[PDB]
Structures are given as structure tokens and as C-alpha cells.
């Protein structure tokens, strides 16, 4: 009777899907690259899909995935043990080198672009008429670090346009030079902001702009990443 069938003719649309799914889910990351960077031993009872053609925004090229997933750069980790798995100690400076918690990426040297056309990530001092409607406007807040010291004031706010939302803060350091901070990693209060991740002196190493009015996705990683990394190695001072 139809009863029996329907419940099995469906463990089909179920396992036959567990597939169709975990398939698509292997375009970025696999095949595995051993403890060196060479194809490894047992490579999952799963194949690799039929790479598809993406049609990027505004003819700014195209991406086909999966595909030549090259590690477009170097690394400063040199194994402290003999067998598979184990940790890989940093060479010198983990942050600058761009590793571990501070790790950054190999993404295009360009700024996101809204559907309209213009740069997509902009600075308030240049937004097309942007007043801060409510909240605690930091433009002028003496941002402090974690090891207790002054390091810079808020001089502007960076927003995403059609996603009108606070994304970044420019802050002039000890030498009148502009740095950029990850909204999503700071704390405004009554009068003083606070960066839980890093400290006074470590603001120095913060990678910086290459045009304080347009910032690329690429650069974003570098900084964001860096900032992160500091939650671990910039803690003997906080």
C-alpha cells in the first residue's frame, strides 16, 4: 500500500539530497592540501561538483568556482612537532606577518560597489548629507585602549550606503595620522570609547589606508583581522 512507499521513496529525496547539498558545499576549501600543500591521503567519499560560472557586478570580471585555489601569499609558521595535526608556532611577529587569530585574506584590491555604481563604503565627512540620528555621536570622543592610555579621538564615521549602518571610525593617532577601527569591536559610553582588543602602542602597527575616502575589501580584512589577532597576544598589558 501507498503508505509503505511514500516513507521510503522519501529517504531518497533525503539521502539523495544530503548529497546534492554537501556537494555544492565543497567549492571553496577542498580538495585538501596536506601538512605541506599537496593533495592528502583519504579524500572524503565525496566528489567535486561541476564548477559554475558567476557573473559578477558591472562586468568587473567573473568568478568560476570551484577552481585554482592558490594561496596568493606567504606564511610564518614552522611546525613544533613531528606527526599530523599538531600546532605550528609563529616565526616572528604573528600580527604583521598576518597569522593565527590576526590572519587576513587574498581578496581583490577594490571597494565594494552598490548596485547604483559608486563606491559602496564611504566616510561621513563625504556621505551625501548624513546626520547621526540618535545614539551617542563619537565625533570628538577620546578613544582609549586596553592597557590604559589615550591614543586618538573620533574624527569621522564610515557607513555603508544602502545598508545605512555604522561601520567604522577614523581616529587621528599621536602624530595627526588617520587609522580605521571595526565598529563591531569597540564600546562607546558617556564620553570615552574603548577598544577591548588592542592597546595604546599597538595602534602603531595598524595597517592603513591608501585613500582616506574609499577603502577596498582587501584592506578591510588586513585591519579587521589584525585587530582580532590582538585579543590573544596583546593581553600581557591589559
Amino acid at each position: 500500500d501507498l503508505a509503505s512507499l511514500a516513507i521510503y521513496s522519501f529517504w531518497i529525496f533525503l539521502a539523495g539530497l544530503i548529497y546534492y547539498l554537501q556537494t555544492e558545499n565543497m567549492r571553496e576549501g577542498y580538495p585538501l592540501e596536506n601538512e605541506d600543500g599537496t593533495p592528502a591521503a583519504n579524500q572524503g567519499p565525496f566528489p567535486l561538483p561541476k564548477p559554475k560560472t558567476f557573473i559578477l557586478p558591472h562586468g568587473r570580471g567573473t568568478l568560476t568556482v570551484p577552481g585554482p585555489e592558490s594561496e596568493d601569499r606567504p606564511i610564518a609558521l614552522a611546525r613544533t612537532a613531528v606527526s599530523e595535526g599538531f600546532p605550528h608556532a609563529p616565526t616572528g611577529d604573528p600580527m604583521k606577518d598576518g597569522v593565527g587569530p590576526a590572519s587576513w585574506v587574498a581578496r581583490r584590491d577594490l571597494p565594494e560597489l552598490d548596485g547604483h555604481g559608486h563606491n559602496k563604503i564611504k566616510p561621513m565627512k563625504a556621505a551625501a548629507g548624513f546626520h547621526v540620528s540618535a545614539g551617542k555621536n563619537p565625533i570628538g570622543l577620546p578613544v582609549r585602549g586596553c592597557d590604559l592610555e589615550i591614543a586618538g579621538k573620533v574624527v569621522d564615521i564610515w557607513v555603508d550606503i544602502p545598508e545605512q549602518m555604522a561601520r567604522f571610525l577614523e581616529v587621528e593617532l599621536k602624530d595627526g595620522s588617520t587609522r580605521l577601527l571595526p565598529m563591531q569591536m569597540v564600546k562607546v559610553q558617556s564620553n570615552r570609547v574603548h577598544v577591548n582588543a588592542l592597546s595604546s602602542d599597538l595602534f602603531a602597527g595598524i595597517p592603513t589606508i591608501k585613500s582616506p575616502t574609499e577603502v577596498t575589501l582587501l584592506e578591510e580584512d588586513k585591519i579587521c583581522g589584525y585587530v582580532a589577532g590582538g585579543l590573544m597576544y596583546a593581553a600581557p598589558k591589559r
Binding site: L2, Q22, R27, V132, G135, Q184, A228
Partner: protein
């Protein structure tokens, strides 16, 4: 402590990114809306406009001719009384038209025959609405991924709103409009069939209403944690994966055994859910014409 990105410490604003254009007909988009300075601490603070179309109308419109029948039968029982319409508002119940009639369009008004003229407007509101999720998906140029998953819900609905009750010939084996009236309709259904935990479509349909709970409730736990790294906007990650998308799947492989990409994760749960109104949709289409009882099948399996 710190900043659990649940509330953007700050809000801002500009005009209103009206949106795109493509081939859309804007001689039909209207005026914007105010700016709830609260709806902001979360998503956008912006509001409006919308597409008032050939279908914009028909949809909502006939969508009213429905709730103004569940506002016509409660302004009858309550005895045109403003106090009863409140007290015994819930209990109010317009059940279907008895087994006697059956498959007839000749049911007297008062007794059940006002349930018909009520359902009718309902259909013309969902398949006049579902039908619109397309056009919007089209004038924009987006896969029917949306319009599709809707059908999903319609499923469970169609089964319990016209489907099952045609192979039953009893307009009275459907659900009534009223707060509690249907709540019992369900309980009084787990029963005229036996026990419904014994149903791998409620032993599975159920299953799904759990992942779409754990899963979705993992994507936030996920996505958010790494906002600090371009976590948010998911789009320009598929087309360029960053420490964002990376560190992401990275936690799960070092945790559950594997992971998904950026594009993937979505196609993940997307089905996860649709499968609840689908398994359900089925789950019930059987009870009443292929299994006159279910504790039966718990022992039998044939």
C-alpha cells in the same frame, strides 16, 4: 563585559536608497514612509514604499473580503454586542458545513454555508499573492528561489484546505476560523486517527521544525560572531571569501566534523525548512483515505 552585536550602538541616515529599477514599473511605486528610530537598532530604520499593482490590489483586497467574514460572524454571535465581541472573542467559531451536504455549493448561509464564501476569498488571496512573489522576483531578475519556497507552505495549507477534503467529500473535515475552534480541531484530529507521534511525517515533519530551529539558530550564532570581519553582508564573500567566510566554516570543521561554504550554508537550511510544510503537507493527506488509523501502522509497516 563587551559588545554583543545585538544593538548597533549608533544609528545614522540619509535620504532613502529607493532601490533599483531594472524593468520594474515605478509609475506604480508610491511615497516612502517615516523612520521608526527604533526599528533601527536592528535592521534598517527606513520604511517604504511598495508596489501597488494589478496584483497588489486583487491580493490584499480579496484578502480583506476574507477577514471581513471573520469579522461578520463574530459580530453576529457576540449579538452585535461590543462587550461579547471581546470576552468570548476567541471561543467564537465558524465551523465547516456538515457531512450531510458533502461536495455541494448549495449549503444554506447561516449553517456552515458562510464558511464556503469565506474560504473562496482566502484562496484568491494566497494564489493572488504567491503569484506576485514571482513578478517581484522577475522585474528584479532573481531566481524563483523565493516564489518556489512559498509553494512549500501552500502545500500544508492546500492539503488542509481543499486537498484532503475532496477525497473525503466532507467539507466538514477541514479547519474552522476562530481562535480556539481549530486548536481543538487539531487535538480532535490527533485522535480520530489515533496518536500522531506515530507518523514519520510528524516524526519527521517534526524533525525539521527542529533544525530550522537549531540550524537557523546557528547561522546567527555564526554570522554575527565574526561581523568584525565583514561578517554581515554575505554577498561579497561568495564572490571573494574573506577571513570572514573562512574563520567561519573553520570553527565548525574543528567542531562538528565539517562545514559548508558561504553559498552552501544557505542552500542548507533553505530546504531544511520548506521540508516542514512538505513532509507535513504529505503527512496529513493520508490520514482519512490511506490509513483509517495510525497506531495500526506502528506495528504493521504495510
Amino acid at each position: 563585559a563587551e559588545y554583543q552585536n545585538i544593538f548597533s550602538q549608533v544609528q545614522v541616515r540619509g535620504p532613502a536608497d529607493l532601490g533599483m529599477t531594472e524593468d520594474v514599473n515605478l509609475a506604480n511605486r508610491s511615497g516612502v514612509g517615516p523612520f521608526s528610530t527604533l526599528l533601527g537598532w536592528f535592521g534598517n530604520a527606513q520604511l517604504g514604499p511598495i508596489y501597488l499593482g494589478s496584483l497588489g490590489v486583487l491580493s490584499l483586497f480579496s484578502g480583506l473580503m476574507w477577514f471581513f467574514t471573520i469579522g461578520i460572524w463574530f459580530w453576529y454571535q457576540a449579538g452585535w454586542n461590543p462587550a461579547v465581541f471581546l470576552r468570548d472573542l476567541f471561543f467564537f467559531s465558524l465551523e465547516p458545513p456538515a457531512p450531510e451536504y458533502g461536495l455541494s455549493f448549495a449549503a444554506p448561509l447561516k449553517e456552515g454555508g458562510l464558511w464556503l464564501i469565506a474560504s473562496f476569498f482566502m484562496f484568491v488571496a494566497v494564489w493572488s499573492w504567491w503569484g506576485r512573489t514571482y513578478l517581484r522576483a522577475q522585474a528584479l531578475g532573481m531566481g524563483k528561489h523565493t516564489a518556489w519556497a512559498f509553494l512549500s507552505a501552500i502545500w500544508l495549507w492546500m492539503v488542509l484546505g481543499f486537498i484532503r477534503p475532496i477525497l473525503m467529500g466532507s467539507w466538514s473535515e477541514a479547519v474552522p476560523y476562530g481562535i480556539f475552534s481549530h486548536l481543538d480541531w487539531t487535538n480532535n484530529f490527533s485522535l480520530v486517527h489515533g496518536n500522531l507521534f506515530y507518523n514519520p511525517f510528524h516524526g519527521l515533519s517534526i524533525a525539521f521544525l527542529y533544525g530550522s530551529a537549531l540550524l537557523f539558530a546557528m547561522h546567527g550564532a555564526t554570522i554575527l560572531a565574526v561581523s568584525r570581519f565583514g561578517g554581515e553582508r554575505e554577498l561579497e564573500q561568495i564572490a571573494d571569501r574573506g577571513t570572514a567566510a573562512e574563520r567561519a566554516a573553520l570553527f565548525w570543521r574543528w567542531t562538528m566534523g565539517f562545514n559548508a561554504t558561504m553559498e552552501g550554508i544557505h542552500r542548507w537550511a533553505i530546504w531544511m525548512a520548506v521540508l516542514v510544510t512538505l513532509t507535513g503537507g504529505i503527512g496529513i493527506l493520508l490520514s482519512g483515505t490511506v490509513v483509517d488509523n495510525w497506531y495500526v501502522w506502528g506495528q504493521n509497516h504495510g
